[PDB]
Amino acid sequence: LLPAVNPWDVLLCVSGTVIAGENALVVALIASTPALRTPMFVLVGSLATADLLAGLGLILHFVFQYLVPSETVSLLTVGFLVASFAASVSSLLAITVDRYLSLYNPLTYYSRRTLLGVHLLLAATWTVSLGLGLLPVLGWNCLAERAACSVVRPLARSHVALLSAAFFMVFGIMLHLYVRICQVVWRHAADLEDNWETLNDNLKVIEKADNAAQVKDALTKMRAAALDAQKATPDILVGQIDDALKLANEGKVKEAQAAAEQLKTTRNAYIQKYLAHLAATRKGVRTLAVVLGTFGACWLPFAIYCVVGSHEDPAVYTYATLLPATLNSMINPIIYAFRNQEIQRALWLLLDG
Ligand SMILES: Cc1cc2nc(NC(C)C)c(N3CCN(Cc4ccc(F)cc4F)CC3)nc2cn1
Ligand code: NA
């Protein structure tokens, strides 16, 4: 398709309908499903709305780039594409802090600070994304004799470059947070083993002592280890330790040890529970990793070409950089369905009349 410019367009022309359609479906499910009202999925919905504007913007671009009322309207549509890109990258960052903050300390991840911040994230996102998309309609265009146009007219090279430079820095920070997220998950997975080691060491030393105090020390060091596992990623175990502790103090070494050995019944069920949650956390973080990789891999080529390209360069270099960026909004709805089970359930929920 090197010499085929319009066939490059027709590929994107109908692809905008797909991107507009599929995202329009996702935004509905988040809005129409209470289980998806959690901050994670609300922020994902914003990305869908951002990816939604991408499909609408280019659809109206072709509809107006070919037999439109006027070109000034086409200068609004480019704002939609600008607005979508800012609304997509901005919200994509927002999902990262939600993951980091949620994993960093869920107890501090309360329904007050979080839900408050969530509305500001979307508000601070779209108020800026739209604002950037509206700047061209206030003079930030390239249709002047003293302004050089970019690969995507009427956007000027000066302004697309600032967006490109801003995008690199924003994407550079999102990578840093993802590592911090990993550090959080690693740390949450590290202190857990220490509690398990101390918890098991305490159980064993309980048997290897004939003093009623050695039992108290191990249980006290055991209760603290049990408690530390709760503050990390927020009953019967500690409750049974309390019952075990209640016996140790009042001279019940023989029977207090018996209660310590029933903890294994709960502890075996207690340990088997935490492992699954980290599996859910890793996949949730893993899905975050995949999304970030696709976003950059599909937008970065355009981010560079719009700054280092020349108007003496062929057009195929333009679409070759827009094609991944355009279809990036088509792929984002697909990723969550195949990875995130909570939203995938609603997708296959509708099965028959
Ligand atoms: C036929 C056609 C389709 C276009 N489809 C655009 N969008 C799609 C890829 C969602 C698009 N936009 C314009 C706004 N732009 C913002 C931007 C993004 C990154 C960057 F480094 C610098 C920037 F200025 C994104 C691409 N222009 C187009 C021009 N003609
Ligand atoms: Na996107």
Side-chain angles (χ1 to χ4, degrees), residues 47 51 88 295 299 328-329 332:
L47 169 56
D51 286 358
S88 65
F295 191 74
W299 270 110
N328 167 262
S329 295
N332 289 22

Side-chain angles (χ1 to χ4, degrees), residues 172-213 215-227:
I173 298 171
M174 294 158 60
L175 296 175
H176 172 44
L177 279 176
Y178 181 82
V179 174
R180 289 176 61 187
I181 291 170
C182 291
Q183 296 173 359
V184 163
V185 189
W186 298 335
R187 215 61 46 247
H188 290 2
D191 59 335
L192 254 53
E193 167 167 340
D194 290 322
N195 297 121
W196 166 274
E197 292 180 11
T198 58
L199 196 91
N200 288 21
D201 297 354
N202 289 125
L203 277 162
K204 281 159 177 292
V205 299
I206 281 167
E207 305 166 1
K208 308 291 182 176
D210 199 6
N211 273 276
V215 171
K216 193 216 273 193
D217 290 69
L219 285 162
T220 48
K221 297 180 184 269
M222 188 189 305
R223 190 206 175 106
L227 290 170

Side-chain angles (χ1 to χ4, degrees), residues 12 54 61 81-82 85 152 155 160 163-164 299 302-303 306 322 325-326:
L12 84 87
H61 177 71
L81 291 311
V82 169
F85 174 77
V152 282
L155 300 162
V160 300
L163 291 175
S164 183
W299 270 110
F302 179 78
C306 73
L322 291 170
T326 52

Side-chain angles (χ1 to χ4, degrees), residues 36-66 69-109 111-144 146-152 154-213 215-229 231-234 236-271 273 275-332:
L36 303 177
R37 202 203 67 79
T38 179
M40 177 198 165
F41 283 96
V42 173
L43 296 166
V44 173
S46 170
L47 169 56
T49 305
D51 286 358
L52 174 59
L53 266 67
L56 306 179
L58 73 79
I59 278 290
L60 300 142
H61 177 71
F62 160 86
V63 171
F64 288 60
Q65 179 170 20
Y66 301 73
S70 61
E71 194 279 349
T72 292
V73 181
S74 180
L75 181 146
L76 285 93
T77 63
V78 80
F80 264 26
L81 291 311
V82 169
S84 66
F85 174 77
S88 65
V89 70
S90 181
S91 66
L92 202 59
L93 173 74
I95 304 174
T96 298
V97 300
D98 191 65
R99 189 75 64 171
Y100 168 76
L101 294 173
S102 62
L103 298 174
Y104 183 88
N105 211 339
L107 63 97
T108 75
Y109 190 84
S111 300
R112 43 185 165 91
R113 285 289 279 231
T114 59
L115 281 290
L116 169 56
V118 173
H119 277 265
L120 281 76
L121 289 176
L122 303 191
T125 287
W126 295 97
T127 55
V128 176
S129 304
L130 291 160
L132 276 299
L134 297 179
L135 287 176
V137 180
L138 284 77
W140 282 257
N141 64 111
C142 74
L143 302 178
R146 196 71 94 96
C149 287
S150 65
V151 63
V152 282
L155 300 162
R157 293 199 69 264
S158 169
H159 306 145
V160 300
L162 299 198
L163 291 175
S164 183
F167 166 59
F168 274 95
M169 294 184 156
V170 170
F171 199 99
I173 298 171
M174 294 158 60
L175 296 175
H176 172 44
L177 279 176
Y178 181 82
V179 174
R180 289 176 61 187
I181 291 170
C182 291
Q183 296 173 359
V184 163
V185 189
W186 298 335
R187 215 61 46 247
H188 290 2
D191 59 335
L192 254 53
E193 167 167 340
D194 290 322
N195 297 121
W196 166 274
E197 292 180 11
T198 58
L199 196 91
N200 288 21
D201 297 354
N202 289 125
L203 277 162
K204 281 159 177 292
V205 299
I206 281 167
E207 305 166 1
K208 308 291 182 176
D210 199 6
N211 273 276
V215 171
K216 193 216 273 193
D217 290 69
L219 285 162
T220 48
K221 297 180 184 269
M222 188 189 305
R223 190 206 175 106
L227 290 170
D228 292 1
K231 86 188 305 310
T233 76
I236 198 180
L237 184 160
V238 177
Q240 287 176 356
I241 289 183
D242 300 358
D243 302 5
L245 245 181
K246 183 181 180 63
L247 301 155
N249 290 261
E250 41 177 340
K252 297 190 178 186
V253 178
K254 291 293 183 190
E255 197 201 3
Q257 294 157 326
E261 305 296 348
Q262 73 152 10
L263 304 182
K264 297 177 173 176
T265 67
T266 52
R267 179 255 290 184
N268 288 344
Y270 222 80
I271 187 64
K273 197 187 77 186
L275 301 172
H277 188 211
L278 277 55
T281 295
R282 286 201 180 88
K283 297 304 99 178
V285 175
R286 268 296 104 198
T287 302
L288 182 65
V290 163
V291 172
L292 295 167
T294 62
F295 191 74
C298 295
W299 270 110
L300 277 164
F302 179 78
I304 296 171
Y305 184 72
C306 73
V307 177
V308 304
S310 189
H311 58 298
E312 286 68 0
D313 260 344
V316 64
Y317 293 176
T318 301
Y319 304 106
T321 63
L322 291 170
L323 181 68
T326 52
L327 67 87
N328 167 262
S329 295
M330 196 214 72
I331 280 178
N332 289 22

